[PDB]
Structure 1
């Protein structure tokens, strides 16, 4: 039982041919106040896995702390906790998804919408979403919320379907990401211009990026718009 209070903006992601790409802003939002640009909503876990999270930060804060434990736990009694007995984007997701649904089903949800950015141990892009309803789904692209509305189209316009992915480089998508980032940073009050991005690649592994600032916005023509209407001056 909860409501958003300290709130993270939308999270967007998609998997490309060689891996996955994900970005979320550095902002986090308390009401109309955009309260903290010190909010990293993209959470790396190991190389193969990064986690986007939206909604409650304290939840997310709570959540994230739970995650290291998994590692430290997966560490325990595990020589290969680094090796194949390392954690897997699938697992972590799988682990997590259980929680939310329960938490939901407990009528004590965790307030967040969450994508697990991963590229599997076999190098398979792990891109799969989980909500605070605990309903999950996976898809070539995962954007959340405001992004899910605008960015998924962009990234579904990037990859219409699965076959698109093996055709989909990092940068091609990556570009659209930052583009979508701008796009989102265009049309959202909550969207932040500064943001962060991560890329798990089947090869380079995790590629994470910081303080990425939305650019390439056309604010020019606005000057050309006078009043809302028939006002001519």
Structure 2
């Protein structure tokens, strides 16, 4: 039995024609206090997988160490560690999914929602979700927390089903992700303006973008809004 202390908010993601995109803001909230601002919640594993984590940050750091250790363990007695026997996104996910469900079964969960985004060795896009309960699911778009409520609707307008994936380019897909992050900054009280974004492409590989900011915001209309009903001044 736990309660989460230092927490990370939404992680959002989607598939596009050649790969996957995933994003998450750089905030570590302490209740209503926006305590830590330099927190990286996207953690790359190799050059073909990115694990995005929301929820308790102490448990996130534990999971970082596990993934870091997984890379080390895989390299042991493995001449093809950087080739055929490298870590796949599906291997990394199944490992985490096993841990998450084992921990919930011992009534001592890792208080997180996790999205494993990556590209397999055969070029196939990988995007799957797992949380503190060990619940797993996959979809063309995936999001956690407020992202599930606000981002998914916007991302599903681009990729509503499987057949829309080949029709979606990396430019269009990233534009939708960046737009979603802005909407979350408008509407999520535990979000920040600063965020990180990662693209895993089957051709161009892993592109990790840090220190992005929400921009092109609409605030000007606020000056016209006065009172709560009858006020004119």
The TM-score, its normalising length taken from structure 1, stands at: 0.98
Offset at residue 106 of structure 1 (A):
1.1
- CA positional deviation for 1:213: 0.3
* Secondary structure of 2:14 counterpart: strand
Equivalent residue, structure 2, for 1:6: 6
Select between 221-230 and 110-119 the one with higher mean Cα deviation: 221-230
CA distance in structure 1 between the aligned counterparts of 2:163 and 2:154, rounded to whole angstroms: 16
* Inter-partner Cα distance in structure 2 for 1:85 and 1:70: 13
Deviation at 1:85, TM superposition (A): 0.6
TM-score under structure 2 normalisation?
0.98
Question: How large is the Cα RMSD of the aligned pairs?
Answer: 0.8
Gaps of 5+ in 2: none
Post-superposition offset of 1:208: 1.0
Report SS of the residue matched to 1:80.
coil
Q: Determine if the alignment matches structure 1 residue 116 to structure 2 residue 105.
A: no
Paired with 1:116 and 1:228, the residues of 2 have a C-alpha distance of: 44
Deviation for aligned residue 1:143 = 1.1
Structure 1: which 5+ runs fail to align?
Answer: none
> How far did 1:207 drift?
1.2
Distance 2:87 2:64 in 1: 15
What is the CA distance between 1:223 and its match in structure 2? 0.9
Q: Deviations over 1:31-85 (max 9, x none)?
A: 1111111111111111110010000111000110110110000011111111111
Describe the superposition over 1:162-199 as per-residue Cα deviations: whole angstroms up to 9, x where unpaired.
11111111110101101000011111111111100001
Partner Cα distance (2:85, 2:92) in 1: 13
SS across alignment from 2:122? coil
Number of residue pairs aligned between Structure 1 and Structure 2:
233
Runs of 4 or more off by more than 4 Å in structure 1?
none
Helix, strand or coil at the partner of 1:23 = strand
Aligned mates of 2:228, 2:198 — CA distance in 1: 40
1:90 alignment partner in structure 2: 90
Partners of 1:92 and 1:3 lie apart in 2 by 26
SS at the partner of 2:7? strand
Q: What displacement does 1:205 show?
A: 1.4
SS in 1 for 2:80: helix
Alpha-carbon offset, residue 121 of structure 1: 1.2
Q: Secondary structure at the match of 2:165?
A: helix
CA shift digits 1:133-169 (9 cap, x unpaired): 1101111011111011100111111100111111111
Query: Could you report, residue by residue, the CA deviation over 1:8-29 in whole angstroms, capped at 9, with x for unpaired residues?
Result: 1110001111000000001121
For 1:104 and 1:158, how far apart are their aligned partners in 2? 35
Find the aligned partners of 2:142 and 2:54 in 1 and give their Cα distance. Answer: 13
Deviation for aligned residue 1:105: 1.2
